């Protein structure tokens, strides 16, 4: 496969067809979806990696979208890429302002 011609696990042909069929440029070059499939494989691996670490660290064996919520919102840069994106069944990462915590001794 062309994924094996590049050593990846993403569809070069399907992504390639999707670059030609959205009217982005009249010509589409030789190795462009190779590069772009590499970038998306890195990003997918990052988010699923952090949801894996949080997936053990909240005692399940299966990634649910809650782990995608606090998986994404804990890295700074993944949050900055996705700062305008709600993800459904995510909820809120636990933030408590300092004046709300009790004034005990």
């Amino acid at each position: 496969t062309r994924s094996s011609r590049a050593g990846l696990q993403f569809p070069v042909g399907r992504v390639h067809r999707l670059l030609r069929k959205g009217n982005y440029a009249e010509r589409v070059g030789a190795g462009a979806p190779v590069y772009l499939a590499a970038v998306l494989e890195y990003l997918t691996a990052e988010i699923l990696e952090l949801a894996g670490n949080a997936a053990r660290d909240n005692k399940k064996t299966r990634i649910i979208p809650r782990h995608l919520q606090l998986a994404v919102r804990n890295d700074e840069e993944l949050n900055k890429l996705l700062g305008r994106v709600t993800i459904a069944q995510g909820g809120v990462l636990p933030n408590i302002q300092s004046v709300l915590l009790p004034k005990k001794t």
Binding site: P65, R84, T86, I87, A88, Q89
Partner: protein, 84 residues
């Protein structure tokens, strides 16, 4: 084919707005918060489904779908995954 409907804005209850505020991390809620909250939710839904119903009208279809409102949410800069 004569379905009529009115006064559902009070259906969003006072404890429901309490539950959303306590998901937001809010301790104490004043008295007139609830009516204004119904107003803000009403404005947001008026814009979102005003824009969504136009997507449903352009395909000349009489049924609003999920792709309709996810696309109309995307256009307002409030993109929401988990439906398409």
């Amino acid at each position: 084919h004569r379905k009529v409907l009115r006064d559902n804005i009070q259906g969003i209850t006072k404890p429901a707005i309490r539950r959303l505020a306590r998901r937001g991390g809010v301790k104490r809620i004043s008295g007139l918060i609830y009516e204004e909250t119904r107003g803000v939710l009403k404005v947001f839904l008026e814009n979102v489904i005003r824009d969504a119903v136009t997507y449903t009208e352009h395909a000349k279809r009489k049924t609003v779908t999920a792709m309709d409102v996810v696309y109309a949410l995307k256009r307002q800069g409030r993109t929401l995954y988990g439906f398409g």
